[PDB]
Amino acid sequence: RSKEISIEVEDIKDAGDTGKRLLKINTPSGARNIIIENEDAKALINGETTNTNKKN
Amino acid sequence: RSKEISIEVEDIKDAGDTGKRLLKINTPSGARNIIIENEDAKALINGETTNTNKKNLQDLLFSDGNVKAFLQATTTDENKTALQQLLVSNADVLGLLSGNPTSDNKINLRTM
């Protein structure tokens, strides 16, 4: 009868929507895409800014 | 096989690598260390920036190189010429600010 019963993210009944997205994410870039909504701030944190991002 | 299901993070089969690291983390600082890969951006968010972090953040924030030199408080004579042009529109006054006005600038500055 198995040994571990590896649950999945959606089995965690009091996890939040952003919380489940973060738990599923594999890389730091993916996490930043979830967490940072302001596109200019995200661009700064990614070290990749256009002239429009810089002005903003 | 059953007492209670006090599962652990690695029992969650479809959790991602970053997702499991975040679920295990205890503090906001730890979470920021996982999520933010750019060291200059992480330093800004932590409110703890070196002069190198500041210069690198200025590179992410501003496109104009003459403006960037001004913000670093280190300007060449070429940077100064360009910055003068952002600050003053009169061509004869720009001649004066250069320290080397042309003959025409000199005549016009006296008239002025």
UniProtKB/Swiss-Prot annotation, chain B:
Main role? Protein that forms the 55 capsid fibers. These fibers are not always present and may have been lost in some lab strains. They may enhance the attachment of the virions onto the host cell wall.
Interval of the full protein contained in this chain: 114 to 225 of 280
**Similarity comment text for this entry:** Belongs to the phi29likevirus major capsid fiber protein family.
Its lineage opens with: Viruses, Duplodnaviria, Heunggongvirae, Uroviricota, Caudoviricetes
This chain's protein is named Capsid fiber protein
Q: Where in the cell is it found?
A: Virion
Quaternary structure per UniProt?
Homotrimer. Forms a super helix coiled coil in the homotrimer.
